Design a protein around this motif. Structure first.
Motif, PDB file in Angstrom:
ATOM      1  N   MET B 235     -25.744 -43.012 -18.682  1.00 41.90           N
ATOM      2  CA  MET B 235     -25.362 -41.750 -19.234  1.00 41.90           C
ATOM      3  C   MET B 235     -24.321 -41.929 -20.163  1.00 41.90           C
ATOM      4  O   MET B 235     -24.372 -41.575 -21.249  1.00 41.90           O
ATOM      5  N   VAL B 236     -23.229 -42.328 -19.640  1.00 43.37           N
ATOM      6  CA  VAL B 236     -21.787 -42.490 -20.499  1.00 43.37           C
ATOM      7  C   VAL B 236     -22.200 -43.385 -21.682  1.00 43.37           C
ATOM      8  O   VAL B 236     -21.653 -42.828 -22.584  1.00 43.37           O
ATOM      9  N   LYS B 378     -26.346 -35.648 -13.385  1.00 45.81           N
ATOM     10  CA  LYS B 378     -25.392 -34.941 -14.443  1.00 45.81           C
ATOM     11  C   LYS B 378     -23.898 -34.938 -14.134  1.00 45.81           C
ATOM     12  O   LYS B 378     -22.937 -35.251 -14.828  1.00 45.81           O
ATOM     13  N   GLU B 379     -23.685 -34.535 -12.970  1.00 48.39           N
ATOM     14  CA  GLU B 379     -22.204 -34.185 -12.500  1.00 48.39           C
ATOM     15  C   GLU B 379     -21.483 -35.847 -12.439  1.00 48.39           C
ATOM     16  O   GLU B 379     -20.178 -36.004 -12.732  1.00 48.39           O
ATOM     17  N   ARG B 380     -21.874 -36.722 -11.818  1.00 48.66           N
ATOM     18  CA  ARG B 380     -21.557 -38.146 -11.729  1.00 48.66           C
ATOM     19  C   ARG B 380     -21.042 -38.586 -13.203  1.00 48.66           C
ATOM     20  O   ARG B 380     -20.173 -39.276 -13.076  1.00 48.66           O
ATOM     21  N   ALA B 381     -22.014 -38.317 -13.894  1.00 52.48           N
ATOM     22  CA  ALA B 381     -21.512 -38.698 -15.505  1.00 52.48           C
ATOM     23  C   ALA B 381     -20.733 -37.965 -16.129  1.00 52.48           C
ATOM     24  O   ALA B 381     -19.689 -38.470 -16.766  1.00 52.48           O
ATOM     25  N   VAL B 382     -20.467 -36.593 -15.799  1.00 57.34           N
ATOM     26  CA  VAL B 382     -19.471 -35.726 -16.216  1.00 57.34           C
ATOM     27  C   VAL B 382     -18.327 -36.187 -15.650  1.00 57.34           C
ATOM     28  O   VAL B 382     -17.026 -36.064 -16.410  1.00 57.34           O
ATOM     29  N   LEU B 383     -18.151 -36.565 -14.396  1.00 58.85           N
ATOM     30  CA  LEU B 383     -17.122 -37.091 -13.653  1.00 58.85           C
ATOM     31  C   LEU B 383     -16.632 -38.434 -14.597  1.00 58.85           C
ATOM     32  O   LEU B 383     -15.342 -38.424 -14.790  1.00 58.85           O
ATOM     33  N   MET B 385     -16.842 -39.259 -17.549  1.00 58.73           N
ATOM     34  CA  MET B 385     -16.491 -39.088 -18.711  1.00 58.73           C
ATOM     35  C   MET B 385     -14.922 -38.432 -18.455  1.00 58.73           C
ATOM     36  O   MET B 385     -14.004 -38.946 -19.132  1.00 58.73           O
ATOM     37  N   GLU B 386     -14.585 -37.680 -17.513  1.00 58.79           N
ATOM     38  CA  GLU B 386     -13.270 -37.268 -16.999  1.00 58.79           C
ATOM     39  C   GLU B 386     -12.309 -38.333 -16.734  1.00 58.79           C
ATOM     40  O   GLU B 386     -11.317 -38.330 -17.206  1.00 58.79           O
ATOM     41  N   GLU B 387     -12.646 -39.203 -15.880  1.00 59.64           N
ATOM     42  CA  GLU B 387     -11.890 -40.356 -15.537  1.00 59.64           C
ATOM     43  C   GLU B 387     -11.467 -41.260 -16.846  1.00 59.64           C
ATOM     44  O   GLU B 387     -10.625 -41.816 -17.028  1.00 59.64           O
TER      45      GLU B 387
END
Ligand code: B12
Ligand SMILES: Cc1ncc(COP(=O)(O)O)c(/C=N/CCC[C@H](N)C(=O)O)c1O
Ligand SMILES: C[C@H]1O[C@@H](n2cnc3c(N)ncnc32)[C@@H](O)[C@@H]1O
Lengths: 110, 728
Positions: B235-236, B378-383, B385-387
């Motif tokens: 996803m990233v 979706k949430e894991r991929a958003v995480l 991105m954040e890291e």
């Protein structure tokens, strides 16, 4: 999980918040990358310019190799070939073939 | 001009005048929609415009050889090292439905710091040059004229010389290509700074040429310890390349995600892969989906590969695929053969057409486990991105091994690939644009000081030189060859011989390779060596075992082998003899209704065989609408003869099973003798058959036609309307 305590702050976002956050950050990440491409160049970008100006792959390596040796990359390999063509009142083509063989690098350093 | 269906491609003649070759057209083409398209007896809800010439699926024969085409562009990978053999394969696949031909590059082309020229031989791919690209596109322009649907031609822009290839590709009308900055960094250890500065120009040149762009994410499947854990990374990567390409100017509708479903059975693969597919497609609304097939979980069994590709297709059908790319079923076994690209395209076309309009009847239970998992991904991929942001950006995250890690993000096992920002191929070849930097051409991305030479030309920086090669194609420098033994020219004089004999091939002309499949009643190892022996004992060369499946440890072993055939054969020295249809027969017995009398003559109690060619069960004359008046067994010479009369019959049919004393061939006589001796033997036909009966020793008994061991109803009915279209 880990994961459980990691996701905690997304817990309450709606799908749209979540999705737009996904993209907001993607864009935050790439901006410094795109900005590097505006402000800089490379041997292959410069050769690719020379290909578009009408020189063969062989002639393009020749010009850029020499352009790097004269610390001139920052002016642009194509700009070099163009200015010389103008100044010594020849053709973009003539000036290139010329430069790719060592002629005129003197004149270009000024 | 040229190309007739029955005349091979003049490969010789295509290589002529390449210096004068222009692409007939530019950019990518999708397929045409065909609302409620009728073909034969059927209406189709998801089809595209049909082909003018093609090769329909085998079982298309039962429906008027209709060859319907799905809506997604169907891809096929063709690149064997000798592009000039490949051309011939392209024409094959093109007819079998492929409209996207993808040429993989010769091994390691990423590292070529510039274009190369001419037609060197490749390994594991085709060396990508201006000549070899001109050849293939020129050829395809013909093949797409012939099949009647434009074919997108496709290769790779990756490596340290993307801007270079991108210029040539844009010039020579290549339609689609891969370009992913991340591909160069993670898998070819190209220096990360210069990889990304380069992609800006690559992607801008491809934006100009209207090329489809496929990304690199499908490489993260290949490199993952377990594929079913890599999705947050996919996803990233799909995101970083897309938002990068968008902002460079590339069209949101030319940006394709290379997306392969991560698993395969025995993994519960639909369950694992369906949420990711849905998630990705929701999260990436707007971008195109380039569905690829499985290559990670694959082996030497082509049957296994095909079964997993159909579930792969099912994922695409249950979600969406703008491009549906393919993998040849023999992929895990050998470098792809002619026949297996055609298996690939056939499989894709057949399963998709088989699923036509499935989504008017099937739909995703979007709330349930499916919906939850879609969320979680979706949430894991958003995480993820954040890291990346918290760690100082993309470069930092790559330095830290965020990528290629065998963990299930946010799990980190610490075994990912770390690249150094100042390290890698092309390290320290990054120059800063000076205030007076300038670039006199179309489609340059970065800072360009044109206003110093002419304010008014800023939007057409190419004018400074009265047009660049993108405007002025004659300004292009063509190069024919550089090596003088390593070229297509040599390679093709090498076998002028076969271009009036013939032999088998799998990729290259007269390569002599062929496939042997056998079973042997022993352990897998023993039989593996046993097979190689039978193989040589069959005169085969360069024998090697390419697949081995156990049936059961003690009972036997499936073995498949390839070998070369050490000799040719003349088409000229071949002797070859210069079809009464199902419908032709059923229709005769309607215009002119027909009737039969059948019996098992002699003291023969065997009723099975005669019954075999009458009972409809096995397509006996009954099926064709023949009137049959059966008389039973032990029926006598005359009761059968009398009957044809007493019933007004157009034919007698009798059988003999018991044979002692030639009682069979015998009885056919007194039947013909008592058929003339009465006077029916010239406005009636008479046929017989049995275990021991040849249609030859039957005409030599007076009876009209004979039928021996293995005669089906088709054989009788075909004869019964023929010996009647002579007399009558
Ligand atoms: C099972 C069997 C029997 C069954 C018959 C089943 C039945 N009720 O119909 C019974 C009936 C159990 C039987 C009896 C005997 N039979 Co018996 N029967 C067999 C056996 C094994 C079956 C063959 C069969 O069913 N054929 C299957 C069909 C599909 O093949 P087909 O009959 O040849 O017909 C095909 C072609 O002939 C063609 N065709 C045939 N007729 C016609 C007609 C027309 C118009 C057309 C277009 C095509 C056509 O199409 C068919 C399908 O392709 C065969 C052995 C054999 N394989 O030949 C003997 C066999 C023919 N019978 C044999 C013998 C010896 C006997 C017995 C004398 C044995 C004994 N009891 O001592 C007895 C008595 C015979 C009698 N009473 O008439 C011998 C023949 C000896 C000989 N050649 O003279 C055979 C060859 C077996 C053997 N080797 O011993 N047996
Ligand atoms: C984005 C990218 N750039 C370059 C290369 C390879 O090219 P070189 O050797 O680095 O020059 C690859 C290859 N891997 C994919 C193979 C076929 C696949 N199944 C397909 O879908 O494409 C790649 O994916
Ligand atoms: C080994 C390889 O190097 C190339 N190559 C580049 N320049 C030349 C040259 N002047 N002579 C021969 N080969 C050359 C190829 O195109 C090739 O096959």
């Amino acid at each position: 999980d880990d994961f459980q305590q990691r996701r905690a702050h997304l817990a309450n976002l709606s799908d749209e918040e979540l999705q737009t956050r996904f993209w907001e950050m993607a864009e935050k990440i790439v901006d410094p990358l795109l900005d590097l491409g505006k402000k800089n160049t490379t041997p292959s970008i410069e050769r690719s310019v020379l290909l578009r100006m009408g020189f063969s792959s062989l002639e393009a390596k020749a010009i850029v190799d020499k352009t790097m040796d004269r610390g001139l990359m920052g002016k642009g390999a194509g700009h070099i070939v163009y200015k010389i063509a103008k100044e010594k009142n020849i053709s973009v083509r003539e000036a290139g073939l010329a430069l790719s063989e060592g002629k005129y690098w003197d004149d270009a350093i000024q | 001009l040229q190309l007739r269906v029955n005349e091979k491609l003049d490969v010789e003649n295509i290589l002529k005048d390449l210096d004068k070759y222009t692409p007939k057209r530019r950019g990518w083409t999708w397929r045409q929609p065909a609302e409620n398209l009728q073909m034969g007896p059927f209406i189709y809800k998801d089809a595209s415009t049909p082909l003018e010439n093609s090769v329909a699926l085998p079982s298309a024969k039962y429906f008027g050889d209709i060859d319907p085409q799905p809506l997604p562009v169907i891809t096929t990978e063709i690149a064997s090292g000798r592009f000039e053999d490949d051309i011939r394969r392209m024409r094959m696949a093109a007819w079998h439905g492929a409209d996207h031909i993808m040429v993989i590059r010769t091994a390691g082309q990423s590292h070529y710091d510039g274009l190369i020229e001419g037609t060197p031989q490749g390994i594991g791919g085709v060396p990508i040059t201006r000549k070899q690209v001109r050849a293939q596109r020129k050829a395809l322009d013909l093949i797409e004229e012939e099949v009647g649907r434009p074919i997108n031609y496709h290769s790779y822009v990756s490596g340290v010389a993307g801007p270079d290839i991108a210029v040539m590709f844009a010039e020579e009308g290549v339609n689609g290509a891969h370009q992913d900055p991340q591909y160069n960094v993670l898998y070819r250890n190209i220096n990360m700074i210069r990889s990304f500065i380069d992609a800006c120009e690559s992607k801008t040149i491809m934006a100009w040429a209207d090329m489809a762009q496929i990304d690199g994410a499908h490489n993260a499947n290949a490199t993952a310890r377990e594929a079913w854990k890599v999705m947050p990374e996919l996803m990233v990567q799909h995101a970083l390349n897309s938002i990068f390409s968008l902002k460079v100017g590339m069209k949101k509708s030319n940006i394709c995600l290379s997306t392969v479903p991560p698993t395969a059975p025995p993994a519960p693969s639909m369950y694992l892969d369906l949420p990711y597919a849905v998630a990705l497609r929701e999260m990436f609304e707007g971008y195109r989906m380039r569905a690829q097939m499985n290559t990670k979980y694959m082996e030497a069994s082509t049957r296994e590969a095909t079964v997993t590709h159909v579930l792969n297709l099912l994922i695409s059908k249950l979600t969406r695929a703008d491009i549906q790319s393919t993998i040849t079923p023999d992929e895990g076994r050998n470098v792809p053969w002619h026949i297996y690209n055609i298996e690939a395209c056939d499989t894709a076309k057949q399963a998709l057409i088989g699923m036509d309009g499935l989504m008017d009847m099937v739909q995703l239970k979007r709330e349930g486990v499916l919906g939850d998992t879609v969320r979680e991904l979706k949430e894991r991929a958003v995480l993820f991105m954040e890291e990346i942001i918290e760690a100082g950006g993309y470069f930092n995250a790559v330095e830290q091994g965020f990528f290629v890690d065998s963990g299930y993000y946010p799990e980190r096992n610490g075994d990912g690939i770390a690249r150094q920002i100042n390290g890698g191929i092309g390290a320290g070849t990054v120059f800063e644009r000076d205030e007076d930097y300038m670039a006199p051409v179309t489609a340059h991305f970065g800072y360009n000081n044109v206003k110093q030479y002419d304010e008014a030309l800023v939007s057409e920086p190419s004018k400074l030189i009265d047009g660049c090669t993108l405007e002025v194609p004659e300004k292009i420098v063509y190069i024919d060859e550089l090596d003088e033994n390593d070229n297509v020219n040599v390679r093709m004089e090498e076998t002028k011989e076969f271009r009036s004999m013939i032999k088998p091939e799998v990729e290259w002309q007269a390569d002599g390779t062929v496939l042997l499949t056998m079973f042997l009643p022993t352990s897998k190892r023993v039989a593996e060596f046993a097979a190689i022996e039978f193989a040589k004992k069959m005169n085969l060369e360069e024998v090697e075992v390419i697949n081995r499946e156990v049936m059961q440890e003690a009972e036997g072993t499936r073995i498949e082998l390839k070998g070369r055939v050490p000799f040719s054969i003349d088409i000229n020295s071949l002797v070859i003899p210069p079809i009464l249809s199902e419908d032709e027969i059923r229709e005769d017995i309607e215009k002119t209704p027909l009737k039969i009398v059948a019996a098992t003559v002699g003291e023969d109690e065997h009723s099975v065989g005669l019954r075999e060619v009458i009972d409809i069960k096995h397509g006996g004359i009954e099926k064709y609408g023949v009137e049959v008046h059966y008389l039973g067994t032990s029926v006598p010479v005359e009761k059968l003869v009398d009957a044809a009369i007493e019933l007004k019959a157009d034919a007698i049919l009798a059988s003999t099973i018991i044979s002692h004393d030639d009682i069979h061939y015998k009885n056919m006589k007194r039947i013909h003798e008592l058929a003339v001796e009465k006077g029916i033997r010239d406005k009636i036909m008479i046929g017989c058959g049995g275990t021991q009966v040849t249609p030859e020793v039957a005409v030599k008994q007076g009876v009209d036609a004979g039928f021996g061991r293995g005669s089906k109803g088709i054989h009788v009915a075909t004869f019964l309307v023929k010996k009647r279209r002579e007399m009558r």
